[PDB]
């Protein structure tokens, strides 16, 4: 019985949505998760909720894929893509109880999304790649929820200008893995160091012998731990690195012992080779990429063509920071590597602060990906509901009735925002619609004002990509869940 | 204590009606300045402020899931 299969798929997914429904907004309710590793966590971060939910229901594991896709697509508001999915499924339950076959339902949601994206493109507040006023404006307002948002004004040009440099004005893609944020203890919140190249988390040789810097430096990556089970063996290993004249050596962090026996470290000193240790796997993917080099796993496979080139290699030790920056790569195959060192007070503060800036970097990427700012506070969801309801009045057939239910589902975002704000749900959405009858972007759910006003005037705007991908990816989930016909085991 | 706010508009009172407190020995209401009971300002400020954070942390928690 496929109706029983679909019933279970809908009920299960609704229960995941009813779990996250309370988390939307700066006033959101917190969820407690008792994990199987024995840690009880409390947080309002939505992806954290679904990541630590440990969903066992095979159908509901698609809802995690929705969250991750929204994060890799826009990287903000990933709470809302689950809530939007939930309402579309709850509305789908009403459609299923009306006797509309899932295929008719899914294709009608497809046509609703096509019109919905166009609606968002209409209300787009125009931006520009040179418009640093609105770029700094919106970015710092996305940092407004952070612990000290007054010091985020100075963190704003860090994110804005660093991305505007890595990204071309006429460009459709920005890589956030090419912008690495590195924390460092000491300094103030407004104090960060943005470097136009790779930054090494370690310094030259630990023991005496560290050259600390190189001119005309060629960077190789030899990752394998060098230690005795010895003199000639341990020495000859690093000798060949001198043979091809490699001046900077990166060594992967080993699970056995320290990078290299002091015999070959002091020999690398005698070879005048700057030795960099304790490099991470992901650091190699970051570091060897921008440098334009190929990493070597072992100590035997050293070659010449994998030599690098660095204009500036020097140790940046500020108040005992001890981090190396390398700039001027000038490699034909490389990309504009950007790396930032985050100064601050406490190690725990700068760790979370770094993550607060990762949120901001996604905001600017969303604006480069697709130009435009959109009203916050769920205002675009009320506006879309009115337009699709207006279009559903002239649309004919069962396709019109499903379009109407889509509009009802669009209220889950402005409703959730109002509920978690503690305002009478019907009072708020009633006022939202009355205001949208006159204005367009002049509306939005305001936490500070406890009412409806212009989030543009409240400095609360969101990238049009966030809303566009939220509706787009949601229609993909609705199709995926409604298309589940049976669940079988494979073995 | 209430009379300290009721008669304040006069700025002239039969008593200040402030700095009265509980006598934990005799079980009477006594003036703490004449009695000698003083507490740090930073202490009562830090207590009341931290008390809100404790209450909010609990009231904010509206869902619990066991894995």
UniProtKB/Swiss-Prot annotation, chain A:
GO terms for biological process: chaperone mediated protein folding independent of cofactor; protein folding. It comes from the Eukaryota. InterPro entries: Chap_CCT_delta, Chaperone_TCP-1, Chaperonin_TCP-1_CS, Cpn60/GroEL/TCP-1, GroEL-like_apical_dom_sf, GROEL-like_equatorial_sf, TCP-1-like_intermed_sf, TCP-1_chaperonin. GO terms for molecular function: ATP binding; ATP hydrolysis activity; ATP-dependent protein folding chaperone; unfolded protein binding. The keyword Chaperone applies. CDD domains: TCP1_delta. Its main location: cytoplasm. Pfam families: Cpn60_TCP1. One of its GO terms (cellular component) is chaperonin-containing T-complex. It is found in: Cytoplasm. Keywords: ATP-binding, Chaperone, Cytoplasm, Nucleotide-binding. Heterooligomeric complex of about 850 to 900 kDa that forms two stacked rings, 12 to 16 nm in diameter. Present with 5530 molecules/cell in log phase SD medium. Molecular chaperone; assists the folding of proteins upon ATP hydrolysis. Known to play a role, in vitro, in the folding of actin and tubulin. In yeast may play a role in mitotic spindle formation. Belongs to the TCP-1 chaperonin family. This is T-complex protein 1 subunit delta. It comes from Saccharomyces cerevisiae (strain ATCC 204508 / S288c). The lineage of its organism: Eukaryota, Fungi, Dikarya, Ascomycota, Saccharomycotina. The gene is CCT4.
Curated annotation (Swiss-Prot), chain B:
Belongs to the TCP-1 chaperonin family. It comes from the Eukaryota. It is found in: Cytoplasm. The gene is TCP1. Molecular chaperone; assists the folding of proteins upon ATP hydrolysis. Known to play a role, in vitro, in the folding of actin and tubulin. In yeast may play a role in mitotic spindle formation. Heterooligomeric complex of about 850 to 900 kDa that forms two stacked rings, 12 to 16 nm in diameter. This is T-complex protein 1 subunit alpha.
């Amino acid at each position: 019985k496929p109706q029983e299969v679909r019933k279970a798929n809908i009920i299960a997914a609704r229960s995941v949505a009813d779990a996250i429904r309370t988390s939307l907004g700066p006033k959101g309710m917190d969820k407690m998760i008792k994990t199987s590793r024995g840690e009880i966590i409390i947080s309002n971060d939505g992806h954290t909720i679904l990541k630590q939910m440990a969903i066992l229901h095979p159908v509901a594991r698609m809802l995690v894929e929705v969250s991750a896709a929204q994060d890799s697509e826009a990287g903000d508001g990933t709470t809302s893509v689950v809530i939007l999915t939930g309402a579309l499924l709850g509305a789908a339950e009403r459609l299923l109880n009306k006797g509309i076959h899932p295929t008719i339902i899914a294709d009608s949601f497809q046509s609703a999304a096509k019109r919905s994206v166009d609606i968002l493109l209409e209300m787009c507040h125009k931006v520009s790649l040179s418009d640093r006023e609105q770029l700094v404006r919106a970015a710092s307002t996305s940092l407004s929820s952070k612990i000290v948002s007054q010091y985020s004004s100075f963190l704003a040009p860090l994110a804005v200008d660093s991305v505007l440099k890595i990204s071309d004005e006429n460009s459709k893609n920005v890589d956030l893995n090419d912008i690495r944020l590195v924390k460092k203890v000491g300094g103030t919140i407004d104090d960060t160091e943005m470097i136009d190249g790779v930054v090494l988390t370690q310094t030259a040789i630990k023991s005496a012998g560290g050259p600390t810097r190189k001119e005309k430096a060629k960077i190789g990556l030899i990752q394998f731990q060098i230690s005795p089970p010895e003199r000639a063996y341990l020495l000859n290993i690093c000798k060949k690195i001198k043979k091809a004249k490699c001046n900077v050596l990166l060594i992967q962090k080993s699970i056995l012992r320290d990078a290299v026996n002091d015999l070959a470290l002091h020999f690398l000193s005698k070879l005048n080779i700057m030795v960099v240790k304790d490099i991470e796997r992901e650091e190699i993917e970051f570091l060897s990429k921008g440098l334009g080099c190929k990493p070597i796993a072992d100590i035997e496979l050293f070659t010449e063509d994998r030599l690098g080139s660095a204009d500036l290699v020097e140790e940046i030790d500020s108040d005992g920071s001890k981090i190396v920056r390398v700039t001027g790569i000038r490699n034909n195959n490389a990309r504009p590597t950007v790396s930032v060192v985050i100064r601050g007070a406490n190690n725990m503060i700068i760790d979370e602060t770094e993550r607060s800036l990762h949120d901001a970097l996604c905001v600017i990427r969303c604006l480069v990906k697709e130009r435009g700012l959109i009203a916050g506070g769920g205002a675009p969801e009320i506006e879309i509901s009115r337009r699709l309801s207006k279009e559903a009045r002239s649309m004919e057939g069962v396709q019109a009735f499903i379009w109407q239910e889509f509009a009802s589902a669009l209220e889950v975002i402005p409703t959730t925002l109002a509920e978690n704000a503690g305002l009478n749900s019907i009072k708020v959405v009633t006022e939202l619609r009355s205001k949208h009858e006159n204005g367009e972007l002049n509306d939005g759910i305001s936490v500070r004002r406890s009412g409806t006003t212009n989030t543009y005037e409240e400095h609360i705007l969101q990238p049009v990509l966030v809303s566009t991908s939220a509706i787009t990816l949601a229609s993909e989930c609705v199709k995926s869940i409604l298309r589940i016909d049976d669940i079988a085991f494979s073995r | 204590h209430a009379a300290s706010q009721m008669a304040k508009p006069e700025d002239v009172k039969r008593r200040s009606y402030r700095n009265y407190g509980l006598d934990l020995i005799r079980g009477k209401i006594v003036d703490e300045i004449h009695a000698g009971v003083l507490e740090p300002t930073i202490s009562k400020v830090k207590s009341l402020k931290s008390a809100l954070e404790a209450c909010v942390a609990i009231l904010r928690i509206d869902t619990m899931i066991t894995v």
